[PDB]
Design a binder for this molecule. Structure first.
Ligand code: CPS
Ligand code: ACP
Ligand code: ACP
Ligand code: MG
Ligand code: MG
Lengths: 381, 369
């Protein structure tokens, strides 16, 4: 058999949607250069397709990621179908996912920067977190089943992006970092900080080795669609078997990153979201543990409590890496880069480094999410 | 289907067909071990458990042979479909558990196994390997059925009133004390969760004294059928526990060689792992002062915790050790088995308190006086 992959265009995408049985118009609406996102109208549909390195950032990547993203979306839909787009069709060789159109929603990072507060965002994401992370763990699944899922969701290339960018590069004078010269005194203070780098190393080691559950792997505010009443998580291409606290930490850090871009009393909705997302995660995870654990140890008093404390500790450490990583690393966030005037931008970026560092160092000292919030507020006054 | 169960005649046929008298000498019912005489061993899995364990065993032995060829039997041929490994004959050696029970002291056993542990455990980790490579090895060495036996027998069944357990009734009061101990069971749960999730290196997975050939001058580790990507501390802990199990079967001053072994195996492990880390780590963090030290402390902590589960598991679970079961008279056996439970319990609960291997040894000695 011949190679089946062919790069879609707007006409090809309409032809595909028809051949698959789902007068039409199509527009390519993709935000980056690694994927095409084809919007098809009249009822609407999205066809997403991975772009191979030769035709593309980038970042040399195979189109295998499309298989991960599709399979991860489908898995999430079995547990939280109201919190992810529906998937109608997918194909590994064509590297295509056909999914629900969510054009009536706005990317959460964009809305947050515009000053939208999204009152239910943390309640929805906390539920997403609690259910996705529990139901794919050894707590919820027979170990033989979970062990096959580890193989199926092994994601070497995309893991390599996170291992480098989240956990390694910002902490050294590496080629991928990207920061203003005004920041250099403070960046160098990080590079020279042995005790924080040792802690980042341990966190990386956990990312590399702790195959606890199927994670989303890139759950930032730009990876969520939002309106006042709805929330949908997208693009689980980084999915693999990793630490439970990782997704929780990345999301929380992106909430703090937005808080930093804001001023004064405007920060309060974000601090409320940090509190609510932890609380809802913990409640959701705990309810799932109680009802659906297969573990004979699950209902011994203190075991769930200690499990949550460890997830919490790692989540805050991971949050700290993300705070740092987004500030001086290859991949930045609009929350910080669009701060004006310039000297304010530098000052707030200095604070993301300082808060990130404190999170990493003090992760095992915090007892509750409010301790984390209260420490943050003091540091950013 | 290409699989056919060998007999003594077809074993020699295979050895000749591969261009390399016969007696089946296997000490269990799941594998045939054919000795052919220059000499050769042909091990074959029999078809409850998949014959895929033979592919794991061969692959694991070969990988071990890349780093410690002097400490594992050489492999000449292997075949997944036939479930065979053709390997070096080690008939001139004795199973270390048997020798230890007979009173052999094996002066180099500790230095040899410590070297085996340091090198096998380092060189298959993320410390030594590109993460993309390690991740392929994780897939290759996934071992669901064998891992299942360990998850059940080492980490679960002894801590509850489960059907697989096997203990003398005189031991019941002390068994029920363990079952009723919430805080120890929570800690066993955490160690099981680490076994289930922490894919740190390719481990042997069943490194007890019955899995080692020994003489005065030579040591060879065998049967890595349980191999998979698991916690670095696991093999270290199981081995140490089996040294302590032999100490419990001995009396007084005759225990000293075993305590010496426990000390030397940790020391040699730590030294070997540290030397490899220093020379062969790919990690940009490797050389920050404190990171290796903290890495070792965590390995140590887990090892002690896993030693505790192995002490308990061997005493009251499905799979016993001859060290304990052959103690006479009865009443002494029961006493020594109560101590294996109490020491294993202390190891699990106190694992993060110990600062050095000496602390572990001294605590054990105190308890078993
Ligand atoms: C001062 C505010 C109280 C806010 C409020 O009351 N509103 C709070 C609430 C949580 C507190 C932190 C954690 O406890 C962890 C850690 C424990 C050490 O012991 C000392 C350092 C550190 C970072 C603590 C400092 C300070 O104490 C914090 C930030
Ligand atoms: N289901 C959907 N409904 C409506 N618009 C969608 C959509 N999926 C994607 N889009 C549009 O396409 C953009 C790109 O989506 P997505 O984040 O999946 O692409 P990407 O994977 O190429 C980005 P990255 O490289 O940062 O991960 C979105 O921000 C959105 O505007
Ligand atoms: N390389 C070798 N050289 C000489 N004898 C060997 C040998 N490998 C195995 N044997 C002999 O056969 C016995 C069974 O070997 P082994 O322990 O590998 O098998 P097994 O896997 O069937 C046991 P278990 O069921 O407990 O795991 C050994 O105790 C030893 O006496
Ligand atoms: Mg993407
Ligand atoms: Mg065996």
């Amino acid at each position: 058999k011949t190679p089946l992959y062919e790069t879609l265009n707007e006409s090809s995408a309409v032809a595909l949607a028809v051949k698959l049985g789902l007068t039409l118009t199509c527009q390519e609406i993709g935000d980056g250069n690694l994927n095409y996102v084809f919007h098809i109208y009249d009822r609407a549909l999205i066809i997403k397709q991975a772009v191979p390195y030769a035709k593309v950032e980038s970042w040399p990547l195979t189109i295998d990621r499309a298989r991960i993203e599709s399979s991860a979306l489908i898995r999430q839909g079995e547990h939280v179908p109201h919190l992810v787009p529906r998937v109608f069709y997918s194909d590994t060789e064509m590297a295509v996912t056909v999914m629900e159109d969510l054009s009536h929603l706005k990317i959460a990072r964009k809305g947050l920067i515009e000053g939208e507060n999204y009152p239910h965002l943390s309640q929805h994401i906390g539920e997403f977190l609690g259910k996705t992370l529990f139901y794919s763990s050894d707590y919820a699944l027979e170990p033989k089943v979970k062990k096959q899922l580890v193989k199926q969701f092994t994601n070497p290339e995309l893991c390599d992006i996170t291992e480098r960018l989240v956990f390694t590069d910002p902490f050294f004078d590496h080629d991928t970092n990207d920061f203003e010269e005004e920041l250099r005194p403070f960046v160098e203070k990080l590079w020279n900080n042995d005790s924080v780098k040792i802690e980042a190393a341990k966190l990386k080691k956990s990312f590399l080795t702790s195959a606890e559950t199927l994670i989303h792997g890139d759950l930032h505010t730009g990876s969520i669609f939002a309106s006042e009443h709805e929330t949908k998580v997208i693009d689980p291409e980084f999915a693999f078997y990793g630490p439970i606290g990782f997704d929780v930490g990345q999301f929380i850090a992106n909430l703090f990153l937005n808080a930093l871009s804001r001023d004064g009393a405007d920060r309060e909705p974000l601090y409320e979201h940090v509190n609510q997302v932890w609380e809802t995660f913990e409640e959701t995870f705990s309810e799932a543990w109680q009802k659906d654990s297969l573990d004979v140890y699950a209902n011994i008093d203190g075991y769930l409590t200690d499990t949550l404390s460890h997830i919490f500790e790692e989540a805050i450490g991971f949050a700290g890496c993300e705070l740092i990583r987004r500030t001086i690393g290859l991949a930045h966030v609009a929350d910080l880069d669009t701060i004006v005037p310039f000297d304010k931008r530098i000052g707030r970026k200095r604070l993301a480094l300082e808060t990130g560092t404190a999170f990493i160092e003090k992760r095992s000292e915090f007892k509750t999410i409010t301790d984390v919030i209260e420490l943050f507020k003091l540091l950013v006054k």
